[PDB]
Amino acid sequence: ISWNGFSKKSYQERLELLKAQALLSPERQASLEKDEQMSVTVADQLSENVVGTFSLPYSLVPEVLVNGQEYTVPYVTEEPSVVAAASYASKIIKRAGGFTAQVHQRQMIGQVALYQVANPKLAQEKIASKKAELLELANQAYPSIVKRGGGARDLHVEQIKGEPDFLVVYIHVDTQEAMGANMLNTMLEALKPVLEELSQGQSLMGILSNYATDSLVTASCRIAFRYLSRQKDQGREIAEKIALASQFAQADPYRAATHNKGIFNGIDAILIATGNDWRAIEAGAHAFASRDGRYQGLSCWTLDLEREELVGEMTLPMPVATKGGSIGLNPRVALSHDLLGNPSARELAQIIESIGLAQNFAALKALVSTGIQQGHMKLQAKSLALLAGASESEVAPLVERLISDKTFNLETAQRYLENLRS
Amino acid sequence: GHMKISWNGFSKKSYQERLELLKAQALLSPERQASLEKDEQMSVTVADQLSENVVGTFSLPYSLVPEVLVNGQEYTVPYVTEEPSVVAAASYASKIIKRAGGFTAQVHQRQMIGQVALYQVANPKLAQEKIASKKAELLELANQAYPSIVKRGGGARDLHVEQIKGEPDFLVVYIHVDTQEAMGANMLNTMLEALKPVLEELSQGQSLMGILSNYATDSLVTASCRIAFRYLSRQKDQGREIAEKIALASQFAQADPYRAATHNKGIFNGIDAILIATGNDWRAIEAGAHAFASRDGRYQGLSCWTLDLEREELVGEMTLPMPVATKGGSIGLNPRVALSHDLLGNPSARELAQIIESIGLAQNFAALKALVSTGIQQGHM
Ligand SMILES: CC(C)(COP(=O)([O-])OP(=O)([O-])OC[C@H]1O[C@@H](n2cnc3c(N)ncnc32)[C@H](O)[C@@H]1OP(=O)([O-])[O-])[C@@H](O)C(=O)NCCC(=O)NCCSC(=O)C[C@@](C)(O)CC(=O)[O-]
Numbered sequence A: 001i002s003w004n005g006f007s008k009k010s011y012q013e014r015l016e017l018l019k020a021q022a023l024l025s026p027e028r029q030a031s032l033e034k035d036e037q038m039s040v041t042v043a044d045q046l047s048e049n050v051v052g053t054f055s056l057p058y059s060l061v062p063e064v065l066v067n068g069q070e071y072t073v074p075y076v077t078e079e080p081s082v083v084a085a086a087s088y089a090s091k092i093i094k095r096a097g098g099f100t101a102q103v104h105q106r107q108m109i110g111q112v113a114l115y116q117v118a119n120p121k122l123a124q125e126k127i128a129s130k131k132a133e134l135l136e137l138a139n140q141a142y143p144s145i146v147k148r149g150g151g152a153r154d155l156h157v158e159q160i161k162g163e164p165d166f167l168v169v170y171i172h173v174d175t176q177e178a179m180g181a182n183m184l185n186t187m188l189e190a191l192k193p194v195l196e197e198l199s200q201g202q203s204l205m206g207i208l209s210n211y212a213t214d215s216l217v218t219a220s221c222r223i224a225f226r227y228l229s230r231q232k233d234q235g236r237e238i239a240e241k242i243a244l245a246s247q248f249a250q251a252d253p254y255r256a257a258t259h260n261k262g263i264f265n266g267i268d269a270i271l272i273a274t275g276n277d278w279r280a281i282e283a284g285a286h287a288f289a290s291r292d293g294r295y296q297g298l299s300c301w302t303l304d305l306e307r308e309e310l311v312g313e314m315t316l317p318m319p320v321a322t323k324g325g326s327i328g329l330n331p332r333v334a335l336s337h338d339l340l341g342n343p344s345a346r347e348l349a350q351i352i353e354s355i356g357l358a359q360n361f362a363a364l365k366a367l368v369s370t371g372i373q374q375g376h377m378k379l380q381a382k383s384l385a386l387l388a389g390a391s392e393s394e395v396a397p398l399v400e401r402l403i404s405d406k407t408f409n410l411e412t413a414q415r416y417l418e419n420l421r422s
Numbered sequence B: 001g002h003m004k005i006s007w008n009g010f011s012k013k014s015y016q017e018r019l020e021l022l023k024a025q026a027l028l029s030p031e032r033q034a035s036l037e038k039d040e041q042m043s044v045t046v047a048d049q050l051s052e053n054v055v056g057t058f059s060l061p062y063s064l065v066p067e068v069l070v071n072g073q074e075y076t077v078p079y080v081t082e083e084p085s086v087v088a089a090a091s092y093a094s095k096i097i098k099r100a101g102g103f104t105a106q107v108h109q110r111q112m113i114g115q116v117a118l119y120q121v122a123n124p125k126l127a128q129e130k131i132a133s134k135k136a137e138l139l140e141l142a143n144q145a146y147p148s149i150v151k152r153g154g155g156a157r158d159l160h161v162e163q164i165k166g167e168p169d170f171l172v173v174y175i176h177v178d179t180q181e182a183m184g185a186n187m188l189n190t191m192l193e194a195l196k197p198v199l200e201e202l203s204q205g206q207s208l209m210g211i212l213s214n215y216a217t218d219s220l221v222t223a224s225c226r227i228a229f230r231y232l233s234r235q236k237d238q239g240r241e242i243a244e245k246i247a248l249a250s251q252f253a254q255a256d257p258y259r260a261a262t263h264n265k266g267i268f269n270g271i272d273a274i275l276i277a278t279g280n281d282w283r284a285i286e287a288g289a290h291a292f293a294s295r296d297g298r299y300q301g302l303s304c305w306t307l308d309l310e311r312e313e314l315v316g317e318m319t320l321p322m323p324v325a326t327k328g329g330s331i332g333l334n335p336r337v338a339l340s341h342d343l344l345g346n347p348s349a350r351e352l353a354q355i356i357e358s359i360g361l362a363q364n365f366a367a368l369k370a371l372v373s374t375g376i377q378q379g380h381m
C-alpha cells in the first residue's frame, strides 16, 4: 500500500492507512487510536512540581528512505507546514534514491577542569605519561563486558589559555545504547582525586560535554535535476539557486541562523517523538556550526553539473539514544521507536540526520522558487477545503479558487465547493 | 512579607496538594483553574489545525517554578520539561535569588530583522548607493503590504545594504521591523517578498530569497542578579568559595567550547521549558542564541558570573536574543498555552522576554552551584 493521497486524508483515514501498512503491533495501534497519553502519575516521576500535562500534535512523515531502508517518521511539532515540508522533501528524495548516511564515531566526551596548578606543563606530561594507568583505572569495573572496544578508550590533557589558565583532562567513553552517564560519572569520580594529586591542583568540575564531536553523523542525498522541477531545464536553475542558498548561509550568519533553524524544526520534532534531549543536540550542533571561526550553515548543497545532480550533505553531533529517560515511561515515545522498527541508536541517528537534511531541502527549494509565503497559504486553503467536505479529486480546484482570493474562511470554501458541485 | 500564603515545602507536596496551594494563591480564574484540574489538553481537532498528517497528540509534563522575582514583580513560571531535576533546580535557584533581591532585566530593542539576498549585480557599489538612498520609499513600500501592523504602532523602521564578499558576491538588504506582540514571521516575509521585485530593479541583479532572520540582534535582552555571599551557603562563611568557584566555572565556559556547549545547554533546559509552556518557538531562540555565543569569533558561554569582592557579592548576567511573542501561533489554540500566559499575569512580549531571560540565568546558576559543590552524579529523587 502506498502513501499516495495521504495529504488529503482525514484523521480517521490516516489511522486506517497506518493500520494498513502494518507497522504497529495490535497493542500500539490501539494505544494510538485511543490517543493514549503519558499519565499525570508518570509525568510526576519525570519532572518536579508537576500540576498537569502539556500536549502537542503528533504526526507522521512517510517514505523516509535511509540506506535503502524506508521508514515512517514520527513528528511532534506545533508549527504549520513543517510536517508537510518534510513529507514533500522525503518523497522527492526517495525518488532520487533516498539518503545515504553513516555514523563516524559514537563516543561521549567527559572533562575535568583543574585550576591552581603550579606547573601545568609538568602536570600535563605527568598525567599524560600515566594515561595507561588512568584509563586502566577507569576500566577496572568493566573488564570484558565493556572492554570489547568500549569503555574509556582515550584520554589526554590540554592547556587551555585564558583568565585564568585551566588544565583540562578529556576522557572518551563508548556510549552504548542507553542515555546513562552512570558509566561516565563512575570514571570521572575516581579520576578527579588522582588528577588532583598528579597535577597538584584543584578540581573545578567533572562533567559530560554536549559538544559531542566523538558522535558525528553524516547524511547525504543526490537528486537529479529532472526531479527538482516539472518544467523543462528549470530543475537545473532551481538546483543552482539551492546551491547559492547554501553558500549564502556560509557567508552571512544572519542567514546561517535561519538556515540551521529550519533544520531543527524537523530534528527536534523527531527527537521529541523518540524521547531524546533536543537541548543537547541543539547545543552541540550549533556549536559545531562555528567550528571554523564563524557561525555558518550546518549543511552543504553543491552542483554535480556533469551528472546533472544536486548534492546535499550535513554532518552533526548526534549522540541520540534508544533506552532510558522518558522512552520507557512515555507510551507515545515507545510507540515512536516501534513505528521506526526499533532501530539501533546508530540507525536512529542516521534517520534523524536524514530528516534534518530533508527538512533543509524543502525550505531552500521554497525560498528560491515560489517563496515561503505561497506555500503557507496553500496548506490553509487545503485544510479548509477538507473541512468543507471536498473529495480528493476536488481539493486542488478548490485550493486554486481559495488561494485566488485574498482572505478565505471555512464559509468561503463551503460556498465555492457548492459551486464546484453545481 | 507574610499575610500571603507561602511556597515553603512546595517540593514536598503531592500532586493534588500542589493544585490546592496554587488555588490558594488565586493566580488563575475559575475557568483556568478548573481547566488545569481537569488537565484539559489540546484536542486532536485543534492539533489538526497546527500540523499536518496528525494522527494523535503527544504529552509532556507541566510544572510550576515559583517565586521568580523579576524587577520587583514576582511570578509563578510554567515549565514543560521531560528531564528530572530541571524544575527542582530552577525553583531552588529562584528562591535563593529572590532572597538576594531577585532579577533586574531590560529589553534593549524589540525589532525583527528580515533580509533579501541579491546576486549577479553588475555594480554592487552603485547598487548599494541606489538602494540606500531610497530607504524612505522602500520602507514605506514594506509597510504598505502589511498595513495592520502600522495601525498598531509597528512596522518597518530601518533599512541598510551590505556587500558580503565571497563566492559568489551577495548584496544583502536588511530591514528592521517593529512586530509588536507577535513574532512577525508572516509579517516580515510578506514585506520582503514585496521589496524583492523593486530591489531587483534598483540593483539590476537577481533576487535569491527574501526571508526572516533568526539572528535577532535587534531583540537583545539581558537579566542580572546580585547575590550576597551569605546566601550562597547555609554555613554563611563558605559562600565566598562557592562564589569564586562559580566564577571559575563561568570562565571555563568562556575558554573551552567543550564546556560552553554544556554550560549553554543547561541554560536552555529552562529557557525551552518556558518557551513551550508559553507556546513560543524554541528552535528560533536556540538558533539565534547559539549563534550569538560565537559573536566574538569563538563559541563561548552565554552568561557571565563575576565577583564583587568589595561588596562581597556574586554577579550574574546574560544577554540573549529573545524575540518572543504573546499573540499568534498556538497561543490561543493550545488551552494550556493560554493558561500559561494568564498564570504569568498576561505579561507583554517585552515583559515575557525578561522573565525568560531571568529564568535561564536562574537555571544556569543552579547547575553551576551543583557542579562546583556536590556535583551532578545522578540526583535521583
Ligand atoms: C508545504 C509545501 C509542501 C506545500 O506545497 P504544495 O504545492 O501544496 O504540495 P502538494 O499539496 O501539491 O503535494 C505535494 C506533496 O507534498 C506533501 N504534502 C503537501 N501538502 C501536504 C499536507 N497538507 N499535508 C501532508 N503532506 C503534504 C505531500 O507528500 C504531497 O504529496 P501527496 O500526499 O499529495 O501525494 C511546500 O510549499 C513547501 O515545501 N514549503 C516549505 C516549508 C518549510 O520548508 N518549512 C516549514 C517551516 S517555515 C521556516 O520558518 C523555516 C525556514 C523556511 O525559515 C528555514 C529557512 O529559512 O532556511
Ligand SMILES: CC(C)(COP(=O)([O-])OP(=O)([O-])OC[C@H]1O[C@@H](n2cnc3c(N)ncnc32)[C@H](O)[C@@H]1OP(=O)([O-])[O-])[C@@H](O)C(=O)NCCC(=O)NCCSC(=O)C[C@@](C)(O)CC(=O)[O-]
Pocket (backbone or CB within 6 Å): A048, A049, A207, B007, B008, B009, B010, B011, B012, B083, B084, B085, B086, B087, B088, B089, B090, B091, B092, B093, B095, B262, B263, B264, B265, B266, B267, B269, B364, B366, B367, B368, B370, B371, B376, B379, B381
Ligand atoms: C536539585 C537540588 C535543588 C537538590 O538540592 P537540595 O538542597 O538537597 O534540595 P532541598 O530539598 O534541600 O531544597 C529545597 C528547595 O529546593 C527546590 N527543590 C529541591 N528539591 C526539589 C524537588 N524534588 N522538587 C521540587 N523542588 C525542589 C525547591 O525550591 C525547594 O524549595 P522548598 O519546597 O523546600 O520550599 C540541587 O541539588 C540542585 O539545584 N541541583 C542542580 C541540578 C540541575 O541543575 N539539573 C538540571 C538538569 S542537569 C543539566 O542541566 C546538565 C548540566 C548541569 O551539565 C548543564 C551545565 O553543565 O550547566
